Structures are given as C-alpha cells and as structure tokens.
Structure 1
Amino acid sequence: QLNPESADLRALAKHLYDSYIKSFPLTKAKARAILTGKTTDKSPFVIYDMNSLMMGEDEVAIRIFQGCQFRSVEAVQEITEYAKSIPGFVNLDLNDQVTLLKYGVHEIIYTMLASLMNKDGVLISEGQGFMTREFLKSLRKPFGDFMEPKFEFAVKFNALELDDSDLAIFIAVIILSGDRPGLLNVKPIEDIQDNLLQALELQLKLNHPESSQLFAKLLQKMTDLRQIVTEHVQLLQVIKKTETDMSLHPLLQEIYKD
C-alpha cells in the first residue's frame, strides 16, 4: 500500500539517488553504455598487453598498483561526500563516523568497481581506459591475483542487474553497519540502517518485478564483500613484505592496519 510511511521511504530512495549522482561521477548507467558500445561518447583505450599498456600510458606491475591506490584514495573522497548526505549520518559522533568509513570504504569500492566491470575487464580513468582481466592476471606474482577475486565477485554481483537507484540505497545500508569494531553509539546506527533496509526492500520490490529473494540474495553479498576485503588486506600484508622497496599511500595504511 502507498501509505505515508512508504511515501517517506521512496523520498529516502530519491534523496539518496540524487546525492549518489552528485558524489559519484561515473555511474553504472554511464559505465554500461561505454561497455556495450551504446555510448556515442569517446571510446576508451584498451590495455590488453604490454604494447597497448605503454601506448595507453602516453616496473609495470608496481606502476599499475600505485595508480590504483591513487584511485583507491579519490574513491574514498567521493564516498565520504555521499556518506555525509545519508539522513542521520552527520548527527552521529564524529568518531563513530570515521569508524564506519574506515571499515566501510573498501566494501563500497568493490561494490561500485563491479559497475565498471564486464567478463572482459574493467573501465579506468573515468571511462577513458579499459584494462583486460587476463592482462591484470598476467602481471607478475604476487600482483597477478589481487583483482581476480573482484572479477569473481563482479560477475555474480552484476548478475543481480542492480541499477544506480538500487546501489544508492545498498551502499548506504553498508556504510551504516551496526557491527564495526569500536562503535560507541551502536543503537542509532542500527536505527538508521533499519530505515535504509526498509527503503532498499521496497526499492527492490518496485524496481525488480521479475526477481524475488533479490533483497535476500543482495544482503548475502555483504558477506562475499567482507571476505574479499579481508583477503585483499592479507595480500597487501604479503606484497608489503615481498616488495619492501615501493611505497604504500599512508591513508590506506591507517585503514588497513585495523
């Protein structure tokens, strides 16, 4: 029924979507256009081997990773902006906020990375490039296996055929996780998330007539994520210990260590 309570939920869906569009330049809608040749906007350069990598650019493995950590950080900005737009979020203790975002960003990042991914590879540099999945593998060990798990996550996640409107609400649901280590006011965070979770369930029901237990099937991805993120850190521990010669951006090093 279209009661006042649902109306308010739909308002919450719309606010969140509008904020997401303002904070997130490359939306999934834009990405998929590019990826399907539907766009008439400039086609991206395709890094599929060493040659095309060098021509696109106008050690390798290390360069790519150091470029990704620069995006890894611009992303964390984007995210932070959006998180602040979530109703209730700023009216939380500033030390709960920093916590939710410390433990949350990476989940969001890999959620949204999936928007830029197909079977073949990933869009990069805000739509201007595309790096092939097989190429990111062919990177020398241990750098050959840091994305593979994200591509594995992405192909399953993308099967759900979530749109930007869905992902808006879902990303909020994650950020307001009521079980991050070192949370003072847990009751408020859970109270907002309850509200978001109602919003998301209703959004999904409306937007996905074909597919039941999607809401279910989505929340299960929250788990796949936390796993991916763990395994990513464990690799970063190995890399940091293998290649104690390169430099790891200090802001990531604050997040990763806890």
Structure 2
Amino acid sequence: GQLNPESADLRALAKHLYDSYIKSFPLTKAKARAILTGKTTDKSPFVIYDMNSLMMGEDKIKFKHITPLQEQSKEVAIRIFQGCQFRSVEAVQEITEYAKSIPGFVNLDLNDQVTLLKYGVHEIIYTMLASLMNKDGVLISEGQGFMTREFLKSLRKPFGDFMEPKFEFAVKFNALELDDSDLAIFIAVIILSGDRPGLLNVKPIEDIQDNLLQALELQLKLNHPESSQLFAKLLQKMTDLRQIVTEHVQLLQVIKKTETDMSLHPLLQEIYKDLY
C-alpha cells in the first residue's frame, strides 16, 4: 500500500460521498450513538415502552384519525403502522437525493436509475435503521422518541413480527462498528448493484461499483486497524439485507389479506409493484 494518485482519488471519492451523506440524512449514526450512550446532545427522546407511554407520547408518531370502537390492541398497531409508513416515505426521498451525488449515477439511463433505486431503497433503509438501534430499541422522529424492542414485539399478531428481524440484523451489524464515513460508501455500493432485475446497461453500473468497492476497501483499511476481513464481512451483510426485504414483503402481504382500513402509501406501492 502506497499513497499515490490512485489512492488519493479513492480518498477524494470517499469524502465526496461522506459530504453528500451528511447533507442528505439529518440524523447521522454519530449523532444517534451520542444520544443512545447518554452523551450530551440537543435531544432527549421520549421513551415509548408500553401502550400507556405510547398514548402519552402520541406527538412523536404521525398517524391519521383514530378509528373509534376499535379494540385498543388494534388501534395501537395501526398508529405504529402509519408512523412507520410516513418515515419510510420520508426515508426514500433522502436516499434518492443522496444517489444523485454518486459520481456517474445521473449519467446512467433513467430506466436503470429507477431500477437501481427501486431495489436499493429498502436495503439502505434497513442498513441505516441499525444506526438508530441498540438492543433496547430504536430512535424515532429524528431522535425525538425511542421505541423499545419488546414493545414493538408485543403488538397484536402479526404486527409484532415486523421489527424483530431488523433488530436481530442490527445487533450483529452494529458489532462491525462502522461509522458514517464507512456507511456513505457502503450504501453507494448497494445502490450500484449490477444484478438487479431488468437493467439495460449493466457494464457502466458495474464499472462505477468497481470504483466504489476500491474506495470502500481502502476506507475500511484506514479506518479499522486490526479488524480482520471486515470488507468481506460487510459484503456478506448485503445478502442478509435482501432476505430482510423478502421477509418484510411477505409480512406486508398478510396484512393486505388480513386487514382492510390500512392501505399503503402510493410511493411504497410504486416500489413494491413488481418487486421480484
């Protein structure tokens, strides 16, 4: 390893992605970790750990008009469902904005840009969800609230099955101890996946991702001394991300069967429309 024009170009690419990452995502992992570990921040999230604390902290969740005469277990799960829906729609906007700053991305054919984002957003959502998670729960509303793992698991069937796979993923993923500069390149690697179904021009996508993989490999070398095979371990996580997406779609399908009075936002519809 030597510091030559090629390595300096990979370091500049990493910095450009970090900067775009910082301006596209308001709550970074560094900020979330400070909150979660009790460092001094401008945030003190209200903790939601049961139904009583959920109602007393209704402001943190964005939900529609409460349907009266509903069993309270059902009304609570609908509030959480609509709250995650709002955040997901918001998260997709942040991701598509960040993708534009990936060098070469907007120059790809627009059909392939849509395809890459269609298949990548949820993998990235779950990657960055881990940044806001510890073994106790997840930060919500940009750090204004904290919803516990066990409360999310206690929701009425089948709502209590949605978050658990993300927490299982997150505790293992967070043991890699990646930071925002690592994550900015990693999510770009996810977006530039040449194996998405229906891509027109695969070679330019693979060429960009090859450049991103070089940058990510160098980033982990410089940022994680004595961390053995972190590059390979991180790339293997992408397989876990895809299983989570698949498992999640099948959970959404049982609600489309089980419950009316709970349609999905048209954007999430547009994304899941013919997903695999």
TM-score, with length taken from structure 1: 0.99
- Per the alignment, in what secondary structure is the counterpart of residue 118 of structure 1? coil
Between stretches 87-96 and 243-252, larger displacement belongs to 243-252
Deviation at residue 161 of structure 1 after TM alignment:
0.1
CA distance in 2, matches of 1:213, 1:179: 24
Deviation at residue 246 of structure 1 after TM alignment:
1.6
Offset from partner CA, 1:175-227 (integer Å, 9 cap, x none): 00101111001000000000000000000000000202000000000000000
Deviation at residue 251 of structure 1 after TM alignment:
1.0
- Per the alignment, in what secondary structure is the counterpart of residue 46 of structure 1? strand
CA distance in 2, matches of 1:15, 1:48: 39
2:257 counterpart of 1:256: no
CA distance in 1, matches of 2:127, 2:90: 16
Deviation at residue 39 of structure 1 after TM alignment:
2.4
CA distance in 2, matches of 1:170, 1:39: 28
The aligned counterpart of 1:244 is 260
Offset from partner CA, 1:8-49 (integer Å, 9 cap, x none): 000000000000000010000000000001023231000000
TM-score, with length taken from structure 2: 0.92
Aligned Cα root-mean-square deviation (Å):
0.7
- Per the alignment, in what secondary structure is the counterpart of residue 15 of structure 1? helix
CA distance in 2, matches of 1:42, 1:2: 40
Moved over 4 A (4+): none
CA distance in 2, matches of 1:16, 1:206: 16
CA distance in 2, matches of 1:53, 1:210: 43
CA distance in 1, matches of 2:53, 2:104: 47
Deviation at residue 245 of structure 1 after TM alignment:
2.5
- Per the alignment, in what secondary structure is the counterpart of residue 33 of structure 1? helix
Aligned 1:76-91 pairs, distance under 5 A: 76-91=92-107
The aligned counterpart of 2:65 is none
CA distance in 2, matches of 1:42, 1:192: 38
CA distance in 2, matches of 1:146, 1:39: 32
- Extract unaligned runs of 5+ from structure 1: none
- Per the alignment, in what secondary structure is the counterpart of residue 130 of structure 1? strand
The aligned counterpart of 2:15 is 14
Deviation at residue 254 of structure 1 after TM alignment:
1.5
- Per the alignment, in what secondary structure is the counterpart of residue 139 of structure 2? strand
Between stretches 39-48 and 74-83, larger displacement belongs to 39-48
Offset from partner CA, 1:66-94 (integer Å, 9 cap, x none): 11111001100000110000000000001
Offset from partner CA, 1:123-145 (integer Å, 9 cap, x none): 00000000000000100000000
Deviation at residue 244 of structure 1 after TM alignment:
2.2
Offset from partner CA, 1:37-65 (integer Å, 9 cap, x none): 10232310000001111111141101111
Deviation at residue 247 of structure 1 after TM alignment:
1.7
Identical residues among aligned pairs (%): 100
CA distance in 2, matches of 1:239, 1:111: 24
- Per the alignment, in what secondary structure is the counterpart of residue 5 of structure 1? helix
- Extract unaligned runs of 5+ from structure 2: 60-74
Aligned residues: 258
CA distance in 1, matches of 2:273, 2:97: 23
